[PDB]
């Protein structure tokens, strides 16, 4: 088994376009996710609200859909509740709230794509371990 281009091809948007990440992007995504997100999202769960995880099936059913690069990049700029009804930048790290979440201050557009790619690729690797919690450790 190895990290092939097929593994690294992920949905770019909802219209069905894909994009293929380099191994560099994927690994950068992993480092940046550890930097800015893993304190709450380690392993694809959410420590401060375990009802919502980062599984692709969960992200597909969010509003708007978050199971693609554009959806996830938008979420890191302007996060919303699962139904899209409320904007939660004041309580969730984002570019819009980089003044109160200072670790977001040094994230570029290219960084957001890499973090997004890591979130979409990881379940293809780990399966149920991703978003599964302690039961699958």
């Amino acid at each position: 088994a190895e990290l092939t281009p097929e593994v690294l091809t992920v949905p770019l948007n909802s219209e069905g376009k894909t994009i293929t990440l380099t191994e560099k992007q994927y690994l950068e995504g992993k480092r940046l996710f550890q930097y800015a997100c893993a304190s709450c999202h380690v392993g694809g769960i959410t420590k401060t609200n375990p009802s919502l995880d980062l599984r692709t099936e969960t992200l597909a059913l969010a509003t708007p859909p978050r199971d693609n690069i554009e959806g996830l990049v938008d979420y890191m700029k302007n996060p919303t509740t699962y139904d899209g009804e409320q904007e939660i930048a004041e309580v969730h790290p984002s570019l819009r709230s980089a003044d109160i979440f200072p670790k977001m201050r040094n994230l570029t557009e290219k960084d957001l794509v890499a973090i997004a790619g890591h979130i979409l690729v990881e379940p293809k690797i780990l399966g149920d371990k991703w978003g599964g919690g302690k039961v699958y450790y």
Partner: protein, 334 residues
């Protein structure tokens, strides 16, 4: 010689069957208080709400325990690290429900055993001895402070102190493994080397000295009658013992100097138990054992399990089952 001088001469007298001494003045009342309360509570104490959830655990013999399952139960999680003497309860019945006796026993015990260490220093000074036997005893004593005082302070509750009982000890050890992975901590590992090594060198030194006893008796008598209490001459041949042990390994792996041999016998288990006590004492502040969970990963990113991951599976079972009604929120942070 006035009365105070007479009293001081009796307290510090080297002719008492048991030495009293100034540490003894604190030791004797505190150890008696702890002993009497422990014995009574072990037999007759009613069940105690250890975890503060109105779920009393039965520790005493009269309430359904045997010698193996019985305990004095730690005081309530609702109390935390608050001081709970008898006179802070509205009744003895309240005090007992909330595990008052545990606090009374361990605080009196820890004072008594600390003065026991001082008393070891004090009698050596009265007898003209060298003073460091009490330093050897600091290793078991530090260990008792670790599980009765230090670990409660770091976790914020005497309800996480070690229970005063046999099966309660095993509970403490299993929950400790789930919450700190102590088996993977190098200070517990040095503690194991300390006590395995101590037991090894104990049998070793015993076997070597016994193997080289000078013939002084016939086959029908115990060889122990060949040594006479107070005799000037050594009772075994240390040159013979070294000649044997040095050939068992090689010559320079053997002690020929009794003084340095016996220093080694002191130092190894004492140093190792110091580290064991420092393990409990530093895991009291959640600096836990080595965590290698999912450390080995294949080329794609699959987790390749190791024995460390199997240990983690067992730790999870302990974690999810312990104190099964006491947690409402997803992380067990103390």
């Amino acid at each position: 010689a006035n009365l105070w001088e007479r009293f001081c001469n009796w307290v510090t007298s080297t002719d008492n069957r048991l030495y009293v001494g100034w540490f003894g003045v604190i030791m004797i009342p505190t150890l008696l208080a702890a002993t009497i309360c422990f014995v009574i509570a072990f037999i007759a104490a009613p069940p105690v709400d250890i975890d503060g959830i109105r779920e009393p655990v039965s520790g005493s013999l009269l309430y359904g325990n045997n010698i193996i399952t019985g305990a004095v139960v730690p005081s309530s999680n609702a109390i935390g690290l608050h001081f709970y003497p008898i006179w802070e309860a509205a009744s003895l019945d309240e005090w007992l429900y909330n595990g008052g006796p545990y606090q009374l026993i361990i605080f009196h015990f820890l004072l008594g055993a600390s003065c026991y260490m001082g008393r070891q220093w004090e009698l050596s000074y009265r007898l003209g001895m060298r003073p460091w036997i009490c330093v050897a005893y600091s290793a078991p004593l530090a260990s008792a402070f670790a599980v009765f005082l230090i670990y409660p302070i770091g976790q914020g509750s005497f309800s996480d102190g070690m229970p005063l009982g046999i099966s309660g000890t095993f509970n403490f050890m299993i929950v400790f493994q789930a919450e700190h992975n102590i088996l993977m901590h190098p200070f517990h590992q040095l503690g194991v080397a300390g006590v395995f090594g101590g037991a090894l060198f104990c049998a070793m030194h015993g076997s070597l000295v016994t193997s080289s006893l000078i013939r002084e008796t016939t086959e029908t008598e115990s060889a122990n009658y060949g040594y006479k209490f107070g005799q000037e001459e050594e009772t075994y041949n240390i040159v013979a013992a070294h000649g044997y042990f040095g050939r068992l390994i090689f010559q320079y792996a053997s002690f020929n100097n009794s003084r340095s041999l016996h220093f080694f016998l002191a130092a190894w288990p004492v140093v190792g138990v110091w580290f064991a006590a420092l393990g409990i004492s530093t895991m009291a502040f959640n600096l836990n054992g080595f965590n290698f969970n999912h450390s080995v990963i294949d080329a794609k990113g699959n987790v390749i399990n190791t024995w460390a991951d199997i240990i983690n599976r067992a730790n999870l079972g302990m974690e999810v089952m312990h104190e099964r009604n006491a947690h409402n929120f997803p992380l067990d942070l103390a």
